[PDB]
Amino acid sequence: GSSHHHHHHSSGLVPRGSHMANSGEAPKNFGLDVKITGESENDRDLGTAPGGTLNDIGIDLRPWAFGQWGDWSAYFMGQAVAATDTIETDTLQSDDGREPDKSYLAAREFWVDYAGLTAYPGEHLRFGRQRLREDSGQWQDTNIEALNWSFETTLLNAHAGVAQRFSEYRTDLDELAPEDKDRTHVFGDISTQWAPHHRIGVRIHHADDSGHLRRPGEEVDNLDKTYTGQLTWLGIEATGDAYNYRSSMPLNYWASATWLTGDRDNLTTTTVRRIATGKQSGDVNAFGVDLGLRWNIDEQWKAGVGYARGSGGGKDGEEQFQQTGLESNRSNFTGTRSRVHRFGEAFRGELSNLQAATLFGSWQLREDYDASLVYHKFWRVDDDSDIGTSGINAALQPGEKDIGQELDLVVTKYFKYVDEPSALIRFRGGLFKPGDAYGPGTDSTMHRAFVDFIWRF
Numbered sequence: 001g002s003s004h005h006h007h008h009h010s011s012g013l014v015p016r017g018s019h020m021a022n023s024g025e026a027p028k029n030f031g032l033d034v035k036i037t038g039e040s041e042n043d044r045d046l047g048t049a050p051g052g053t054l055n056d057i058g059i060d061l062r063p064w065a066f067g068q069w070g071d072w073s074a075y076f077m078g079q080a081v082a083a084t085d086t087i088e089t090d091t092l093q094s095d096d097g098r099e100p101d102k103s104y105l106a107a108r109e110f111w112v113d114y115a116g117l118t119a120y121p122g123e124h125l126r127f128g129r130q131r132l133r134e135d136s137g138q139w140q141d142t143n144i145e146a147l148n149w150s151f152e153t154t155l156l157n158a159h160a161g162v163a164q165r166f167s168e169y170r171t172d173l174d175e176l177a178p179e180d181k182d183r184t185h186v187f188g189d190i191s192t193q194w195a196p197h198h199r200i201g202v203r204i205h206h207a208d209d210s211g212h213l214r215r216p217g218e219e220v221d222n223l224d225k226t227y228t229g230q231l232t233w234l235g236i237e238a239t240g241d242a243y244n245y246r247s248s249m250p251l252n253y254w255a256s257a258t259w260l261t262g263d264r265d266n267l268t269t270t271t272v273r274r275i276a277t278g279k280q281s282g283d284v285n286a287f288g289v290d291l292g293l294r295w296n297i298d299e300q301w302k303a304g305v306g307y308a309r310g311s312g313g314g315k316d317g318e319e320q321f322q323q324t325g326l327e328s329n330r331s332n333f334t335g336t337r338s339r340v341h342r343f344g345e346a347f348r349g350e351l352s353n354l355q356a357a358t359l360f361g362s363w364q365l366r367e368d369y370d371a372s373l374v375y376h377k378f379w380r381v382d383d384d385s386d387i388g389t390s391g392i393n394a395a396l397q398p399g400e401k402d403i404g405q406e407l408d409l410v411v412t413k414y415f416k417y418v419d420e421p422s423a424l425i426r427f428r429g430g431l432f433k434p435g436d437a438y439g440p441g442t443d444s445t446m447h448r449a450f451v452d453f454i455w456r457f
């Protein structure tokens with residue numbers, strides 16, 4: 001169930017001989033996830049800089065161990081990567097001493113779990129570096145050091161947790177991303193199934209920076225904070241099988257509305273090299289919405305439409321929405337077993353001063369195949385402000401809303417007619433056509449494409 005150490009993994013695979021594959025089998029005490037990935041990426045900077053391209057292959061080995069003693073359990077997953085260049089073998093990885101190596105080791109998850117606070121097996125308390133995820137992937141979908149309480153039953157779901165990054169636990173990164181340094185997260189949610197397959201809930205997330213900004217006159221570099229914040233997100237979300245590839249309803253939907261409030265102290269800088277010149281404080285009062293509708297046309301075919309908007313601009317930036325920093329924006333919103341980046345495998349938009357229209361169609365055959373075709377159109381909301389994170393590394397021209405368009409294709413075979421697959425092979429690709437906001441001299445297209453072979457043993 002929810003408690004299982006691989007429950008949140010997008011792969012959805014089940015090792016042969018595991019208790020999930022056959023309930024007569026004992027829970028596995030160990031296993032191995034093998035991933036072989038090729039990545040083609042050109043051009044992340046749209047041709048406005050040297051390099052920024054990938055055509056490379058890697059292997060990622062993830063051994064894991066699991067022990068259970070009554071109400072106590074413990075879990076470790078490690079990671080060993082070897083690649084021909086620094087490709088993305090891990091969809092949950094984000095961002096001098098932050099250059100990844102072509103090969104590295106990592107401690108991916110390490111936690112202890114206690115399920116005895118209540119008699120519900122859906123209720124448990126987990127402590128350590130662990131997978132945090134909610135179904136939208138837009139609040140949390142990451143491996144992070146946390147103390148997280150989960151309560152998942154038929155009629156009531158609730159979670160409450162605290163998290164903070166202290167290390168990457170990687171042989172090649174020595175330092176945290178500035179955004180993560182000294183940032184503490186506190187969060188909770190409560191939701192109820194008010195009708196079969198219809199959920200309504202509220203969600204809260206609070207991020208608190210205890211860091212300091214560089215002082216005036218000090219040089220600022222890659223690894224320094226751009227800002228410190230006290231930010232609270234308060235959201236309501238309604239879903240009808242929003243992310244359930246096995247829905248029997250003719251229509252699935254999601255609707256979320258999120259208010260961001262709090263305050264930011266922003267570092268100001270000038271060039272001389274970058275030098276700090278001061279800081280400016282201000283309140284944040286921003287808003288995000290994500291809406292979608294999926295038609296379940298028959299047993300195999302689905303289609304849908306999406307609309308998202310993160311506010312931008314406003315009186316000294318108060319209306320600039322942003323996400324928690326723990327999000328993936330990866331979800332099953334196209335109604336298949338395969339998770340898809342909600343704002344493009346190529347653009348990888350953060351919902352920050354961003355408006356997106358989305359169309360998709362998908363096809364699924366039992367547990368054996370799925371395919372998604374996704375079209376996105378992106379606009380800035382305030383054309384004098386930047387957007388948030390994105391997989392495109394090029395500057396936006398002031399006064400231009402048209403960010404661009406994207407076409408994504410995901411195609412997956414699961415295997416090892418198959419009841420519960422234990423392996424998959426997947427093509428994951430996005431084609432991004434930059435709009436006028438990227439100005440002249442840009443590449444007319446860029447792409448990011450992956451082939452992933454995943455095996456769970």
Ligand SMILES: CCCCCCC/C=C/CCCCCCCC(=O)OC[C@@H](O)CO
Nearest residue numbers: 038039040055056057084085427449450451
């Ligand atoms: C299904 C029909 C359509 C086909 C889809 C395939 C999509 C390709 C996506 C990923 C391609 C990865 C290319 C790997 C190059 C590896 C290499 O040996 O070069 C290393 C050298 O560059 C040193 O750095």
Ligand SMILES: CCCCCCC/C=C/CCCCCCCC(=O)OC[C@@H](O)CO
Nearest residue numbers: 029065066067068074075076110111112128
């Ligand atoms: C704060 C973060 C804490 C990090 C803890 C990391 C723990 C590492 C996982 C190792 C799993 C525990 C070791 C297994 C014990 C020997 C055994 O086999 O016990 C029987 C078992 O097979 C029953 O299921």
Ligand SMILES: CCCCCCC/C=C/CCCCCCCC(=O)OC[C@@H](O)CO
Nearest residue numbers: 036037057058059082083084085102103453
């Ligand atoms: C059933 C067939 C499935 C198809 C996949 C089988 C292929 C398995 C091998 C994958 C290994 C790729 C990573 C090699 C690391 C090389 C390296 O460390 O790079 C050094 C230097 O050359 C880079 O600059």
Ligand SMILES: CCCCCCC/C=C/CCCCCCCC(=O)OC[C@@H](O)CO
Nearest residue numbers: 061078079080105106107169170171173174
């Ligand atoms: C079946 C074959 C599988 C083979 C792969 C086994 C999986 C890997 C085990 C995981 C080992 C992770 C240890 C992380 C240490 C981080 C660190 O020391 O960082 C130092 C650096 O930051 C400088 O300060």
Ligand SMILES: CCCCCCC/C=C/CCCCCCCC(=O)OC[C@@H](O)CO
Nearest residue numbers: 153154155156158159160187188189190204
């Ligand atoms: C905003 C985020 C805050 C969320 C964290 C909440 C922690 C506080 C606990 C408070 C306990 C109240 C429990 C109500 C009774 C439960 C019940 O009805 O029984 C389960 C049954 O319905 C299933 O079979």
Ligand SMILES: CCCCCCC/C=C/CCCCCCCC(=O)OC[C@@H](O)CO
Nearest residue numbers: 295297302303304305359360361373374375
């Ligand atoms: C990038 C591609 C984006 C495409 C996005 C499209 C979004 C909307 C999907 C709308 C699907 C509704 C189809 C109507 C069902 C056909 C029907 O009813 O035939 C009669 C049958 O019901 C009697 O048996």
Ligand SMILES: CCCCCCC/C=C/CCCCCCCC(=O)OC[C@H](O)CO
Nearest residue numbers: 128129145146147162163164166167174175
């Ligand atoms: C390491 C080489 C690279 C190091 C980068 C620099 C700093 C290293 C500090 C390492 C401190 C690690 C503490 C483990 C805590 C896990 C846990 O128990 O969870 C905490 C709780 O859940 C939080 O809320």
Ligand SMILES: CCCCCCC/C=C/CCCCCCCC(=O)OC[C@H](O)CO
Nearest residue numbers: 195198240253254255291292293305306307
């Ligand atoms: C520029 C703004 C453009 C806005 C257009 C957005 C287009 C995207 C489709 C979103 C369709 C909304 C679906 C969620 C509402 C579900 C619902 O109300 O049902 C009640 C429930 O099912 C009772 O059971």
Ligand SMILES: CCCCCCC/C=C/CCCCCCCC(=O)OC[C@H](O)CO
Nearest residue numbers: 357359373374375376377378405406407408
């Ligand atoms: C038939 C055989 C199957 C072949 C597969 C073909 C897949 C085609 C996907 C292409 C989907 C692109 C949709 C463009 C949206 C229209 C639009 O809005 O552009 C105007 C602009 O947004 C502002 O007005």
Ligand SMILES: CCCCCCC/C=C\CCCCCCCC(=O)OC[C@@H](O)CO
Nearest residue numbers: 365368369371411412413417425426427451
């Ligand atoms: C290199 C990237 C590799 C990505 C692999 C994706 C799979 C290739 C496209 C397969 C999708 C084609 C759809 C027709 C086959 C489904 C069907 O109607 O027949 C089912 C029958 O075969 C049951 O077994």
Ligand SMILES: CCCCCCCCOCCOCCOCCOCCO
Nearest residue numbers: 040042407408409429430431447448449
């Ligand atoms: C390296 C520069 C030249 C790039 C050509 C190789 C690219 C290989 O990957 C294919 C491109 O990515 C595909 C994006 O998905 C396309 C979606 O539209 C398909 C319509 O059915």
Ligand code: NA
Nearest residue numbers: 115118120123
């Ligand atoms: Na419990």
Ligand code: NA
Nearest residue numbers: 244245247335
């Ligand atoms: Na569906």
